[PDB]
Design a binder for this molecule. Structure first.
Ligand SMILES: COc1cc(CNc2ccc(C(=N)N)cc2)c(NS(C)(=O)=O)cc1OCc1ccccc1
Ligand SMILES: *[C@@H]1O[C@H](CO)[C@@H](O)[C@H](O)[C@H]1O
Ligand SMILES: *[C@@H]1O[C@@H](C)[C@@H](O)[C@@H](O)[C@@H]1O
Ligand SMILES: C[As](C)(=O)[O-]
Ligand SMILES: [Ca+2]
Ligand SMILES: [Ca+2]
Ligand SMILES: [Ca+2]
Ligand SMILES: [Ca+2]
Ligand SMILES: [Ca+2]
Ligand SMILES: [Ca+2]
Ligand SMILES: [Ca+2]
Ligand SMILES: [Ca+2]
Ligand SMILES: [Ca+2]
Lengths: 251, 142, 188
């Protein structure tokens, strides 16, 4: 996160930290006790699939406390339309080996219904993005969970307001600033773009890609979660398949 | 207007334009100056656009130059107050006033729903948590 | 389906209607950092009244966009700041009393679409010191002018001779649309 602030411990309870072989890999979003939504590109270079770990209730990566809970990721589901090294369909559904315990520091973000997300949430102007990603485009990552409020743009506006690169599909949407001051960044990939509406937060986006980080003339791009609600729900009701990695058809 | 021999009398705006309808020449015969006659004539001859009573639902019309402006009562909008504010209870309009989910229904009124972990209150619009840790709420802020 | 175009604001005394071409739509309005609000749902008119939305804060800058139906095709309107752009209506001379060598000319404090409590605020209520009125009066072949910060003029008159008056509502700080049209003429 470029240009944001530390999320006070406990005010970003659905945020997830993903680690491979103990190394920081990406962010994610808890949506119930056993499922986590993250970005598919986070897994393009994984080799030891039995070494993915999801940590909840994390905040400061330099201190350990009782709010932290770790779980092996039993399954990583990606749309079978996603292509490593490309931008479209950047989403993944992760099944934790064991459910996490819901506490004051670990709570799931609501997965909304498709139409509510399309016709209402899509027009709430600001949403929060968060992660332990880079603080500067060139820079190193953050030790404390960082959060940033960003305004959403309809795609026609995003393109018109951007310099002339992957295409913004209907499975994406832009959010942020083009003045070069605020954006999420690479290490924030897979983390939540959460929208607040009438007392409740809902998952509307996933940190996905962008030109550099907070590059002038560009906006961050996020997976448009409303297009995957049925996909995520059918899968969540599915039986655990052999092997960690699974590719499920989409639609 | 002009009646038999009235034009022998010097011009009088009251008698001819107020108490009567005066043409442009009678008006010019009064102000004499062209720029003055036009300034007077532009309004005098405009007409009252409110004549047709365009404002609906108890609105109040205010005439302008070749146009009007409708002032409406609270529950109305539109150029002519033709829009009923109390008839916009659909899901696309402010989420049907629902706290969470909104379902339109052709003919009848819209219904509101809630996400798992919540339940719809008796007001038909609000949702309340049924679990201790419902999704979307930040415990330490609650 | 084709995207609306030539979106134009038509505003006077704050009655604000968004118009467009060509002759099913839905309009959304917002301030640069507020949520988007839908208006004129699936209307087949090529216009939409937005008065109730903009009078909530006339000092704000709104942006509107017209969606089209047979993300949706849409077009943005120009930005619109009521207070700096709503056209002042045609004023009216309310009265003029003479007192010897002077004459008081009073301009009517016209109502606007801006609501506050159970009422409509006047043009004065909304602009305060920002609004002045100009007077153009004559008898003689020349014209004269006087300006005022209130809704009243106090001028000198040569006894006996007849006078005619006309007023204009003006907001001097303004760049564009700074003067209303001339009021109807009124004479003694
Ligand atoms: C999923 O696709 C991409 C993800 C990421 C890394 N993830 C990421 C996440 C968020 C943002 C940001 N919001 N500014 C920026 C970056 C990157 N950037 S990288 C090479 O440094 O890792 C690129 C991606 O697409 C290819 C591409 C090519 C050219 C221009 C744009 C995109
Ligand atoms: C009332 O009169 C006005 C002014 O000409 C007209 O435009 C309206 O449509 C009519 O109802
Ligand atoms: C004019 O204004 C409208 C708003 C209503 O008050 C009417 O009753 C009145 O005549
Ligand atoms: C991610 As872009 C379309 O603003 O360059
Ligand atoms: Ca820690
Ligand atoms: Ca006559
Ligand atoms: Ca006559
Ligand atoms: Ca007569
Ligand atoms: Ca008379
Ligand atoms: Ca004549
Ligand atoms: Ca005559
Ligand atoms: Ca004559
Ligand atoms: Ca008129």
């Amino acid at each position: 996160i470029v240009g944001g602030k530390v999320c006070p411990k406990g005010e970003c309870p659905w945020q997830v930290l993903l680690l491979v072989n103990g190394a920081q890999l990406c962010g994610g979003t808890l949506i119930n006790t056993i499922w986590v939504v993250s970005a598919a590109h986070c897994f393009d270079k994984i080799k030891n699939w039995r070494n993915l770990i999801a940590v909840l209730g994390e905040h400061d990566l330099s201190e350990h406390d009782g709010d932290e809970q770790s779980r092996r990721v039993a399954q990583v589901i990606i749309p079978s339309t996603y292509v490593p090294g490309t931008t479209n369909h950047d989403i993944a559904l992760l099944r934790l080996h064991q459910p996490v315990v819901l506490t004051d520091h670990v709570v799931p973000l609501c997965l909304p219904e498709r139409t509510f997300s399309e016709r209402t949430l899509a027009f709430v102007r600001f949403s929060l993005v968060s992660g332990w990603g880079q603080l500067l485009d060139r820079g190193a990552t953050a030790l404390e969970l960082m959060v940033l409020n960003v305004p959403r743009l309809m795609t026609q506006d995003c393109l018109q307001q951007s310099r002339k690169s992957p295409n913004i599909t209907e499975y994406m949407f832009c959010a942020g600033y083009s003045d070069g001051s605020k954006d999420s960044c690479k290490g924030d990939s897979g983390g939540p773009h959460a929208t607040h509406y009438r007392g409740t937060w809902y998952l509307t986006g996933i940190v996905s890609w962008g030109q550099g980080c907070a590059t002038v003339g560009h906006f961050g791009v996020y997976t448009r979660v409303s297009q995957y609600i049925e996909w995520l729900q059918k899968l969540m009701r599915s039986e655990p398949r052999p092997g960690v990695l699974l590719r499920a058809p989409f639609p | 207007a002009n009646a038999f021999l009235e034009e022998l009398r010097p011009g009088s705006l009251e008698r001819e334009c107020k108490e009567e309808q005066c043409s442009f020449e009678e008006a010019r015969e009064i102000f004499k100056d062209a720029e003055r006659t036009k300034l007077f004539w532009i309004s005098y001859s405009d007409g009252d656009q409110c004549a047709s009573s365009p404002c609906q639902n108890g609105g109040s019309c205010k005439d302008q130059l070749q146009s009007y402006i409708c002032f409406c009562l609270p529950a109305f909008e539109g150029r002519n107050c033709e829009t009923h504010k109390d008839d916009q209870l659909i899901c696309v309009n402010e989420n049907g006033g629902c706290e969470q989910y909104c379902s339109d229904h052709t003919g009848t009124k819209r219904s509101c729903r809630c996400h798992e972990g919540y339940s719809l209150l008796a007001d038909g619009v609000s949702c309340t948590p049924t679990v201790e840790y419902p999704c979307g709420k930040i415990p330490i802020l609650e | 389906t084709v995207a609306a175009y030539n979106l134009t604001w038509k505003s006077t005394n704050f009655k604000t209607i968004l118009e467009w071409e060509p002759k099913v739509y839905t309009v959304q309005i917002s301030t640069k950092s507020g949520d988007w609000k839908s208006k004129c749902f699936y209307t087949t008119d090529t216009e939409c009244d937005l008065t109730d939305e903009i009078v909530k804060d006339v000092k704000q800058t709104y942006l509107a966009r017209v969606f089209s139906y047979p993300e949706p095709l849409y077009e943005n309107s120009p930005e619109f700041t009521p207070y700096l752009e709503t056209n002042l209506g045609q004023p009216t001379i309310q009265s003029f009393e003479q007192v010897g060598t002077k004459v008081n000319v009073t301009v009517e404090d016209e109502r606007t679409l801006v609501r506050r409590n159970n009422t409509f605020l006047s043009l004065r209520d909304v602009f305060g010191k920002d609004l002045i009125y100009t007077l153009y009066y004559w008898k003689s072949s020349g014209k004269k002018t006087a300006k005022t910060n209130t809704n009243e003029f106090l001028i000198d008159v040569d006894k006996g001779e007849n006078y005619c008056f006309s007023v204009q509502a003006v907001i001097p700080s303004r760049t564009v649309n700074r003067k209303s049209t001339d009021s109807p003429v009124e004479c003694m």
